[PDB]
Design a protein around this nucleic acid. Sequence first.
RNA 1: GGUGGGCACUCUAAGGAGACUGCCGGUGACAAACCGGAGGAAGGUGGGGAUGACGUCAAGUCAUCAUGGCCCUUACGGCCAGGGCUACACACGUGCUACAAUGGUCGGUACAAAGGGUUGCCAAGCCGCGAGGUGGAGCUAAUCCCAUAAAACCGAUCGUAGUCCGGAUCGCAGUCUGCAACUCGACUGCGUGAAGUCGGAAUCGCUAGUAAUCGUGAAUCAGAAUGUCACGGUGAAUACGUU
Lengths: 153, 126, 82, 208, 101, 116, 100
Amino acid sequence: PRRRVAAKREVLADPKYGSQILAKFMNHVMESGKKAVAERIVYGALDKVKERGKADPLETFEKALDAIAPLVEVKSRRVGGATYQVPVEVRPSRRNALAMRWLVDFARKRGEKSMALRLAGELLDAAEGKGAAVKKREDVHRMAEANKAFSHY
Amino acid sequence: TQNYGTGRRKTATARVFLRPGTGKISINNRGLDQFFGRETARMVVRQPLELTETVEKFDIFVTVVGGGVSGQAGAIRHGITRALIEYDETLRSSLRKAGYVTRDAREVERKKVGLRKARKRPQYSK
Amino acid sequence: PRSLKKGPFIDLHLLKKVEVAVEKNDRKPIKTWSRRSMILPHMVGLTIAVHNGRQHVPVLVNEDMVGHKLGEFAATRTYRGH
Amino acid sequence: MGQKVHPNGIRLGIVKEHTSVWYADRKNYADYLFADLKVREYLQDKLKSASVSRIDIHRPAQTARITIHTARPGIVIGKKGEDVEKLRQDLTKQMGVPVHINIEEIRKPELDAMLVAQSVAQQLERRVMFRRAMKRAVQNAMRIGAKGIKIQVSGRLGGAEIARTEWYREGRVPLHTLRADIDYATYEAHTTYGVIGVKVWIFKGEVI
Amino acid sequence: NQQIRIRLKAFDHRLIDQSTQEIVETAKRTGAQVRGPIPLPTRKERFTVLISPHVNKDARDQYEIRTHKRVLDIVQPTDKTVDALMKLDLAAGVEVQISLG
Amino acid sequence: ARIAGVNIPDNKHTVISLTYIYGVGRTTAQSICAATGVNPAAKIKDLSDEQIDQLRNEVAKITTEGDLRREINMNIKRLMDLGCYRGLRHRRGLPVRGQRTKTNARTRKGPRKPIR
Amino acid sequence: AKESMKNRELKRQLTVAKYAKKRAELKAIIANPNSSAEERWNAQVALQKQPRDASASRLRNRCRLTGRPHGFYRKFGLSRNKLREAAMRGDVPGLVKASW
RNA sequence: GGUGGGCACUCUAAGGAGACUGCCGGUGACAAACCGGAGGAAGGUGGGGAUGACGUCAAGUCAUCAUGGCCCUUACGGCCAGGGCUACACACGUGCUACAAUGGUCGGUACAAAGGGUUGCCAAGCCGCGAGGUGGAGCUAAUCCCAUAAAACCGAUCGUAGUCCGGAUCGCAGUCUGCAACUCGACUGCGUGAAGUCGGAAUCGCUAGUAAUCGUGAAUCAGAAUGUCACGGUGAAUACGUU
């Protein structure tokens, strides 16, 4: 058991778009602390999104994450000597973070040339709601709505 | 005349001089665009003069030594922040609310005996 | 390996033994512990018994094997298999 | 057993000063240190009869001053300073560099850890009960003015087969406060049934 | 002679500090002024030693020796000041270096 | 296209394609291309025939392909009939240059056998 | 301890110093490019009648009291165990354990 | 900063000041204290370290050392040459390098800390593709050398292939140390190019300058680190919560 309040880390806004929402997306796509390398990916990705349709690469990011962020999720829970996967709502602080999770993870496993156009490829592919990250969202939503029997916390 | 400030982030120290001028910068006799190839730190030097409206008010002379890429960026960033607090007195509250007067005390930890690095202890088998 | 500027290294007691042997043509085995001496071009035809830790293994000198070490032709460890 | 670091070492820069106070750079550093520990071994080797506790060795430029603390200076010094001249002759040839011998009188032998360890170990060599040796030692320090003393002895006590560790402590023995001055010393007693180790802590007060 | 320089090294900073001040005190009152005691960076040599006689690699003690250095330059050394300083009889644990006269 | 009897890749740079030849490394391909004048960074399709022949000449003066494999096998053979230590390791397939041979040693022996 | 190794090491120590200045200058001829063949051969011959104890590579640098050959430090010339007991007592000057 | 020059600044190393729930609001037996705020570089023992209570495992160390008893006295003591401690049908533990384009290669171009150096550090210059050789400045060192930080950034190329990924392995020819690189060193160049395309059950480390990644120095040391110790660069995720 713990008594700690953990820690409240703050993220500074991105320098090219003035949106802290991209800052945690940058914070998510990180590998080995290479800040400069990864930010070259998103801006190149956002240029690809902007160059292919749309009007602003920042607003389709907003459109992308809601289609990825689930509204409910189960967790392993033991009450009566057995595991009951009680579906629980996802808090606003976690839904966007896990939205940033599933965009990079499934785009990393795509077959496109480089991540620069691979996260970009998923960005519009997820904004319209027909991508694998969108697919992963609904099966989690499929995991719930079937275990609805267990609703005690 | 000139206004001086000293800033340190990890191991670097910056000496900034806020003499009156138009808008120019000078870090180790080189400009902001040429010294620092990453545009993120280019805000880091200039966020302090954007929150307080002084973007075009001085030709700031800066020298730095030690640290690294971001380490110098924070050290120079802490550099000007004290200088406006030296240049005037009403910007202390505005800069403090943004967390700029505070010196970042975070540094690299001491490597540990029996430890590969900070807190990672070697893999063990039962 | 050994530097060329330093020249190749052979023990002089062996060098005495080889020089005596060639001028004598004894053809008898040369019993030595100096496995580290380089192989001269000019004991071809002589046989040398090189120590391997317990015994002196007789080795016959050819031209293809000139330039090696005397210990390369005297195995010091016995496996025989598992 | 490895819980406690040496009480004097933990305070070697706070309240305790090094026995050897000198400077050397690389190789004279190696030779000088070997000279100190050997003659320190030698100094205790000759005057075990004398009550020798601390051997300070001060080395100014190309000269060495040996400072010996004794609780009975009448033995190290001879007839009108005759014996002491004899000792200064075999250090000044063992060390090389000339040696000047300074002798000080230890006012309270019972307040010094070395002699208390010396007294207990020497008594234990005479097969006196280990219990009585320690009780006498601790009250002697307590009555004279010590504010805390702990004495520990281990190893085949009383001729027993199984060794044990029995310790008596009176007053306050912090051993954790760096500012507090602690006097600590160890002696190994070589009885007929093995080696008997003696540990003595003497607390003299807070250093403010 | 001309800008006498001395070099002071000690394992204890307190020993070197008192040594500098007495050199300053013997420098003043004799018609000469001191540039000041220049703090030279401290050199410490580190040694990692294992404290167990057998095995137990993780049990170690970290040791240090502190090398403190000062420059303490002397300007306009008077003739009655130059011969009042080399005959100093002090600094058992400190070594005094005489340079530039 | 065909150099020293081996078809090098056609859709790759000259300095990289030449490496396919048994006996030509990155430096040798760089050395060959510098001695002939053919630029490293052009694909094989857009080099003229006379420059293919010129590149063919440079490789031929270098021991390559079969003769290099021919050359290597005596050097191994000359050892194992010699009976020395290095030859003996060559006839059993163990560390030749004094490798550990205790734990891994599996570039040589191939795979691990079940029965211990 | 094992004083016989202590006797061996001191015997080696006396031999290296005895042939130090001969072995050094003979090695100089070998390493000097100006000294050509038929005289470098004389030089490389001159090393090998030396007792073979004159090589500085044959020293183990044991402890000064106990002669332990593993836990040695050249700065103090002492074994690691004798290091800590000497450092603990304040015998070695200025060594105070570290914290930072 | 190289020359005068200055004692401003960094920095250096000695004293101090500063953080003490000190003040305010709320809660709390009015008490301890808790929850926030102001100020402040630092706010709640600010961070890290040293520090390991009485005791437990007849835990380990007779091979650091000392030590009771026992054991040998032409040997269970000593010297020397060679060999072995490095073998190798396998298994286990701990690390390094990889499976790649958040990358390889080429070129340009920056930003550290720390340590070592007179039985030593081996500068400039010259020679060699290279490891290295010659050369000998300066330095008992904030002075000179080790000493070029690397990731990062900017352009070109490679275009998803067992490949311009990988560099284990073998062959040739060398450099350095050392009396002597066979057994049994490191490094270099030219060749070759293995398994490996993300890894089962199971299992481990990590809460902030942390994990992850990238270099650097030291000890031991004639020569011999992927191990140990130490330093800095870029730099996170997550903690709903105690079943």
